[PDB]
Design a protein around this ligand. Structure first.
Ligand code: MG
Ligand code: MG
Ligand code: MG
Ligand code: MG
Ligand code: MG
Ligand code: MG
Ligand code: MG
Ligand code: MG
Ligand code: MG
Ligand code: MG
Ligand code: MG
Ligand code: MG
Ligand code: MG
Ligand code: MG
Ligand code: MG
Ligand code: MG
Ligand code: MG
Ligand code: MG
Ligand code: MG
Ligand code: MG
Ligand code: MG
Ligand code: MG
Ligand code: MG
Ligand code: MG
Ligand code: MG
Ligand code: MG
Ligand code: MG
Ligand code: MG
Ligand code: MG
Ligand code: MG
Ligand code: MG
Ligand code: MG
Lengths: 110, 64, 204, 111, 95
RNA sequence: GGGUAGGUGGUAAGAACCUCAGAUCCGGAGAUUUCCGAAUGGAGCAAUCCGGUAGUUGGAAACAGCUAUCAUUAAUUGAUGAAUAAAUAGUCAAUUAAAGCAAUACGUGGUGAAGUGAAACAUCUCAGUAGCCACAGGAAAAGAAAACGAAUGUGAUUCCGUGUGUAGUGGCGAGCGAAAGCGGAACAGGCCAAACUUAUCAUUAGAUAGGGGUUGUAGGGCUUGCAAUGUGGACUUGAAAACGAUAGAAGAAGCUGUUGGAAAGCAGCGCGCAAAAGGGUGAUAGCCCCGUAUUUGAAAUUGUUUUCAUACCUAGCGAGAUCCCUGAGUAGCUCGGAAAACGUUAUUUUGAGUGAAUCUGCCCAGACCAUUGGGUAAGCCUAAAUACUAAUUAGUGACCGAUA
RNA sequence: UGAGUAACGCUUGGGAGUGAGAAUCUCCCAAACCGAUUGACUAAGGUUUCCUGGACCAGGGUCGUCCUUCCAGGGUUAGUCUGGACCUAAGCUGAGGCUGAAAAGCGUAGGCGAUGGACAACAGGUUAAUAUUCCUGUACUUACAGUUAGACUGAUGGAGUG
């Protein structure tokens, strides 16, 4: 029943489906680990649909990891705060580095 | 092992009968004697063989 | 038990003894062996009996029999009244599958036997699965209805062709007979009676 | 097919309850049981347990529920017939819809 | 890459003691066959902030439910301690 | 495919879902199948560690993901190539097979004791048993007479009964014990070498690939004719049909009263049967339920048999020539052993030595010679009857019923 | 039955508290022994016996509200520490190969094999349980890329040191 609709779908859309369901499965398991999953059956439904998608993708002599590795889209949003913290951390590290080298150098000159 | 390389005939185990018919297991060994032959362009290769194959080798003109 | 290297030893001699016994030249003969064996015969000079022996093979083959079963049937008929050269003919022709093939609903005798064994065959005072029961001259052999439910029908036609000692009505699937086959209906493929005297020597 | 389904009217033919009319709410095929409402009312001695948000109250006194009954003791109830009676059923296949339907053998009533 | 090496986050007193005071330290359970680099890569592809360093713990199996009619052993756990840079604190739940 | 109205494996209630676009469940066919383990990239203290190579994606590279491959031996082929000119050894690469396990069971072969008995013990027995090892197979082994054996005789092998505890063999002691014949189960006989001939190899062939041949009342080859186009196989591909195996469908007949907690017991009056096997249902049910007898059904996989065609094999009786071929370190013999019932001996086998002949030939018929007769060694393959049950289905038991 | 007998396997007093119940549990004050050790750190081994809370079926040679017992939860953070990714000793394995009825034995090249050799982090603080590992402070080592300046680079082999 569900497999027929998936059979009509192409391969590229199917690997998009598998990566999206993998992410949702991770989120469901994390929410369950925080005791915030009201519906505990969606984990099983996700895994069965994931298993079914693997069956249709393995019917054709095609993999699921390599095909998405060939073409993909990058990430976004999680960049601004990240670069702020890294810039802050490296500036402090270089400041400490500069202070140490100065202290050693002026000490050796004296 | 103590066996010919041309054929596969090996030792023969039997009894050592003496007076009073006392039984003791003994071993007959084949006469492995070195021999050189000419095969495949006359290539000489020392081969430990039984005297019987050596007599067989001598009559068959191989040994020259 | 090492690097025996059959090339090393075989070429080592090129004739010797073991090579020639083994000589890879060894062909297949996978048809010479079977076929000639198959089955033979002919007549010879020193024993005479050669003619009798060959006739037995033909006779036994005509009905697809193993020699042991034949010895049983001969033992049965041997003892009775007298010169029974009229009895054993009825006995040899009383096979149910033989009657089924002679009845005309099978293309060949062995196919009829297969049918009989596969449970196509309905009898009178009984029913039948084994294709070896010895039948009585005046017996009926009503054919099943499932067989007609599998129309291959081609058979019914052969039935009418028939031979005079069997009376069978086509399509209606029924059969019986009387006036057991005379020697005319047992053609010259096998028509002799000194194989009969031979079986008294081999079978008491 | 099945002799007893979830929903059809049924009566009891043996035991204390004779002519005990009820509606089957659920069928356990493995244990050959059948829960019929209004019959075999048992009253478990309800304890008190408080270990959950709902268990903080869990008000349970003399709750009378339904005990399962062996499917052999059950018999289908006729409704179409003017004189209702207890009988056995067939498994005829009508070619109109090619679906199996139960029919009584002492009458001609479907299901 | 496949991100099966991030099974479940764990929250204890030690974890909450670390998850305060500037740099936060988040403790997850990971694939026992995974390496530190795989843990960092999984965190890269699913959260977006590079860990400052990663520490690993292996908890050995021990007998559990001792004395019960059928005794059983524990399960092998590998713990991972991610530490994000100064001033960044992301939520484990909510994406 | 079957099959439904329930399902989410047991200790197991509850929470939360799925399910009439046909769920769960059963059957057939597939997909995925972590690590160790023959384990086989290298190692290693099993389920661990450390990699190489060729790709591909990120990185500025180290690097990190995602794939495939990388053991050894044997055979074939190709390349390269030492001492040493050639050539090999060796080296490399490719392809094809082998590794291991189990059925506390059957087979073959090698090796192979002792307790014990003989009222001691050494010959002997135990026993070619236990054990160890190698190789299988679904059975294996054996197998088509250089045979039995004493006759106007039988005519591969295997297995059962008898012959009989007989002839014999035994410190003639303990003991051991056939081979003929007869009655049965099953039955099947084939194929190479050599002659002769064809083609090719610096044709020194003495080698390769073909035609011809497979024997004993001798066969075959050489030359010359007649009759033959068939019958049959241990046989290849296909097509068709039948009988099954792996899920299932249908499947008759009862109420009343009484004791009783409860009827199915008991009693009254009935009913069905190709179903009175069994199980359950609050006691002991042919008619309450599931079933059973009986009639049936398979999309898919698989087994047996048959028919048709189709490759591949398969064929008689004469004449003349008097020529050729018929399995050699072989059969015999000697020295030590063994197998057969036999404690070594006519027959079979072999560790050492020696060593023949070629149908007017050779072997055999319990030393041996002659006559008579039987059979054709030193080449190969062979179904069936025979041995066993770890497993699958159905079933049975004057077998057990928690110390059995 | 012996028999409620032998035995209960080196260490005191008191005050307060908990508790239904205290010579045996908690706290305090003493007291007595160890003090080249009954003190502290670890190897091997043990394998959760470690921390918190609860319980007193069973076990504790008595008792027990208590336990190294049981239940539930938690606890072990490394470029620098101990070992691999480095090296070898005794020894093991060991393609080829030799030997041997079979199984196998020996053994070359290679590979393993520390109890040895080489290798960069110290001080303090923090939790009930981890700390050269977490935190603070100050350091060091090895790789890769870019860059600046100088220089010709020099091993699978030889030699010295080790
Ligand atoms: Mg002895
Ligand atoms: Mg660590
Ligand atoms: Mg279906
Ligand atoms: Mg003895
Ligand atoms: Mg004795
Ligand atoms: Mg065989
Ligand atoms: Mg049914
Ligand atoms: Mg019925
Ligand atoms: Mg009954
Ligand atoms: Mg002789
Ligand atoms: Mg003997
Ligand atoms: Mg002769
Ligand atoms: Mg001959
Ligand atoms: Mg027992
Ligand atoms: Mg007991
Ligand atoms: Mg006592
Ligand atoms: Mg007492
Ligand atoms: Mg006393
Ligand atoms: Mg006393
Ligand atoms: Mg005392
Ligand atoms: Mg004490
Ligand atoms: Mg004391
Ligand atoms: Mg002191
Ligand atoms: Mg101490
Ligand atoms: Mg414990
Ligand atoms: Mg404690
Ligand atoms: Mg406590
Ligand atoms: Mg106590
Ligand atoms: Mg540090
Ligand atoms: Mg090492
Ligand atoms: Mg060390
Ligand atoms: Mg501590």
């Amino acid at each position: 029943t569900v497999a027929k609709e998936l059979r009509q779908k192409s391969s590229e859309e199917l690997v998009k489906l598998v990566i999206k369901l993998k992410g949702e499965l991770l989120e469901y398991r994390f929410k369950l680990a925080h005791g915030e999953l009201d519906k505990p059956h969606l984990i099983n439904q996700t895994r069965r649909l994931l298993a079914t998608i693997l069956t249709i993708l393995t019917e054709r002599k095609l993999n699921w990891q390599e095909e998405q590795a060939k073409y993909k889209l990058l990430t976004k949003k999680t960049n601004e705060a990240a670069v702020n913290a890294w810039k802050q951390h490296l500036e402090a590290n270089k400041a400490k580095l500069l202070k140490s080298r100065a202290k050693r150098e002026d000490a050796s000159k004296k | 092992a103590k066996k010919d390389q041309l054929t596969l005939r090996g030792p023969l185990y039997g009894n050592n009968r003496s007076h009073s018919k006392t039984i003791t297991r003994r071993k007959w060994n084949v006469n492995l004697q070195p021999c050189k032959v000419k095969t495949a362009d006359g290539k000489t290769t020392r081969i430990l063989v039984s005297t019987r194959t050596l007599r067989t080798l001598k009559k068959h003109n191989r040994l020259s | 038990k090492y690097t025996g290297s059959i090339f090393k030893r075989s070429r080592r001699l090129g004739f010797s003894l073991l090579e020639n016994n083994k000589e890879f030249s060894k062909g297949k003969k996978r048809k010479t062996i079977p076929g000639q064996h198959g089955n033979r015969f002919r007549s010879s000079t020193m024993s005479g009996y050669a003619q009798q022996l060959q006739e037995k093979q033909r006779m036994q083959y005509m009905y697809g029999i193993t020699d042991k079963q034949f010895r049983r049937l001969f033992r049965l008929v041997l003892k009775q009244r007298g010169n029974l050269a009229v009895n054993l003919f009825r006995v040899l022709e009383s096979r149910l599958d033989n009657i089924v093939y002679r009845m005309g609903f099978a293309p060949t005798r062995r196919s009829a036997r297969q049918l009989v064994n596969h449970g196509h065959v309905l009898l009178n005072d009984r029913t039948v699965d084994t294709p070896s029961i010895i039948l009585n001259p005046g017996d009926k052999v009503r054919l099943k209805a499932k067989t007609i439910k599998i129309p291959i029908v081609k058979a019914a036609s052969e039935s009418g062709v028939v031979s005079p000692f069997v009376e069978t009505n086509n399509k209606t699937f029924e059969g019986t007979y009387v006036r057991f086959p005379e020697r005319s209906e047992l053609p010259a493929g096998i028509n002799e009676s000194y194989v009969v005297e031979w079986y008294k020597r081999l079978v008491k | 097919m099945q002799r007893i389904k979830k929903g059809d009217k049924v009566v009891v033919i043996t035991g204390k309850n004779k002519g005990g009319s009820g509606i089957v709410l659920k069928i356990m095929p493995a244990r050959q049981q059948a829960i019929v409402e209004g019959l075999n009312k048992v009253t478990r001695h309800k304890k008190k347990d408080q270990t959950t948000k709902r268990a903080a109250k869990q008000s349970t006194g003399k709750v009378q529920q339904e005990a399962p009954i062996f499917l052999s003791k059950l018999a289908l109830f006729d409704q179409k017939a003017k004189q209702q009676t207890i009988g056995k059923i067939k498994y005829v296949m009508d070619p109109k819809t090619n679906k199996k339907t139960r029919v009584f053998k002492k009458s001609n009533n479907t299901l | 890459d496949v991100t099966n090496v991030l099974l479940k986050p764990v929250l204890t007193e030690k974890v909450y003691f670390n998850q305060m005071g500037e740099t936060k330290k988040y403790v997850f359970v990971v694939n026992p066959k995974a390496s530190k680099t795989r843990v960092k890569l999984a965190f890269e592809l699913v959260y977006g902030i590079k860990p400052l360093k990663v520490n690993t713990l292996i908890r050995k199996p021990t007998t559990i439910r001792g004395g019960s009619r059928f005794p059983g052993l524990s399960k092998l756990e590998k713990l991972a301690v991610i530490t994000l840079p100064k001033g960044i604190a992301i939520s484990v739940t909510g994406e």
